[PDB]
Design an enzyme around this catalytic site. Structure first.
Site, mmCIF file in Angstrom:
data_model
loop_
_atom_site.group_PDB
_atom_site.id
_atom_site.type_symbol
_atom_site.label_atom_id
_atom_site.label_comp_id
_atom_site.label_asym_id
_atom_site.label_seq_id
_atom_site.Cartn_x
_atom_site.Cartn_y
_atom_site.Cartn_z
ATOM 1 N N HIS A 1 -4.805 -2.772 -7.893
ATOM 2 C CA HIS A 1 -4.695 -1.711 -8.903
ATOM 3 C C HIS A 1 -3.263 -1.314 -9.212
ATOM 4 C CE1 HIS A 1 -4.592 1.214 -5.445
ATOM 5 N NE2 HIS A 1 -3.840 1.918 -6.308
ATOM 6 N N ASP B 1 -9.327 -5.186 -3.476
ATOM 7 C CA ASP B 1 -8.092 -4.561 -4.002
ATOM 8 C C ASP B 1 -6.839 -5.134 -3.322
ATOM 9 O OD1 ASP B 1 -6.446 -2.884 -5.463
ATOM 10 O OD2 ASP B 1 -7.010 -1.071 -4.310
ATOM 11 N N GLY C 1 1.028 7.369 -4.847
ATOM 12 C CA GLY C 1 2.392 6.818 -4.704
ATOM 13 C C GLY C 1 2.456 5.974 -3.413
ATOM 14 N N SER D 1 -0.186 3.868 -2.542
ATOM 15 C CA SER D 1 -1.009 2.721 -2.866
ATOM 16 C C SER D 1 -0.299 1.406 -2.751
ATOM 17 C CB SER D 1 -1.459 2.704 -4.365
ATOM 18 O OG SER D 1 -2.727 3.390 -4.351
ATOM 19 N N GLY D 2 -0.929 0.387 -2.148
ATOM 20 C CA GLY D 2 -0.329 -0.891 -1.951
ATOM 21 C C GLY D 2 0.432 -1.085 -0.618
#
Ligand SMILES: [Ca+2]
Lengths: 223, 14
Positions: A40, A84, A175, A177-178
């Site tokens: 995402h 994801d 912020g 995420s990932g």
């Protein structure tokens, strides 16, 4: 990260910032040319920023390298958030040392109750917004799958796990995420989603990296 | 009320 602590500069050497004229997501360096992040977080024009502590000041350990390839999993579903995961190839190889280093991939899945380290430059408030200059860390355990499914009925797939707290106050947030979830020195999770941040009975949800090790290796080998 | 943790967040009706 809500309820965490200042990591200390370059104490999480595999943590990267994804930048498009602003920080928007984190990632994890898994070799000198490749980064793991969340699907995402995909967009064109990503610049990967390695060796960062204060993302608003040039301090001396930064390497800024453009993404040359940004590869989303072919089965990523944007409504359920299943699969994801994204792989980013750097345009040139990063220079590795103590402050910029890769994190190992799992050889088996982790177990409930194992303590992990989650990190990022995401929001530090559970209500309102405040973005930090320096990297923040949080120690959080892996929850049992039955607790995760009780928390999010009908939404937890076999490629997801919960980690964190049910009492509220400690979690990853926008912020982050990932970014990484590292347990026993292995990259086990990728920050993915949740209901709000640090809310009672709503723990963070993470991509289960141990299910994608073979896919990661094949995707790197063919690119 | 689910949201991804990116900037900006991607969020759903629940
Ligand atoms: Ca910096």
């Amino acid at each position: 990260i809500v309820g965490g602590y200042t990591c200390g500069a370059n104490t999480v050497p595999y943590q990267v910032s994804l930048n498009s004229g602003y920080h928007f997501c984190g990632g994890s360096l898994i070799n000198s040319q490749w980064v793991v992040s969340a699907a995402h977080c995909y967009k064109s024009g990503i610049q990967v920023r390695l060796g960062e502590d204060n993302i608003n000041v040039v301090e001396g350990n930064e390497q800024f390298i453009s993404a040359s390839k940004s590869i989303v999993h072919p089965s990523y579903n944007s409504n359920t958030l299943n699969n994801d995961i994204m792989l980013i190839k750097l345009k040139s190889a990063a220079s590795l040392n103590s402050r910029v280093a890769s994190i190992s991939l799992p050889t088996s899945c982790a177990s409930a109750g194992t303590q992990c380290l989650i990190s990022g430059w995401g929001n530090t408030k559970s209500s309102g917004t405040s973005y930090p200059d320096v990297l923040k860390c949080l120690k959080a355990p892996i929850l049992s799958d039955s607790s995760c499914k009780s928390a999010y009925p009908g939404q937890i797939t076999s490629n997801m796990f919960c980690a964190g707290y049910l009492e509220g106050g400690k979690d990853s947030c926008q912020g982050d995420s990932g970014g990484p979830v590292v347990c026993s020195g292995k990259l086990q999770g990728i920050v993915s989603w949740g209901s709000g941040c640090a809310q009672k009975n709503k723990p963070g949800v993470y991509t289960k990296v141990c299910n994608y090790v073979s896919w990661i290796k094949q995707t790197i080998a063919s690119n | 009320g689910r949201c991804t943790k990116s900037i900006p967040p991607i969020c759903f009706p629940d």
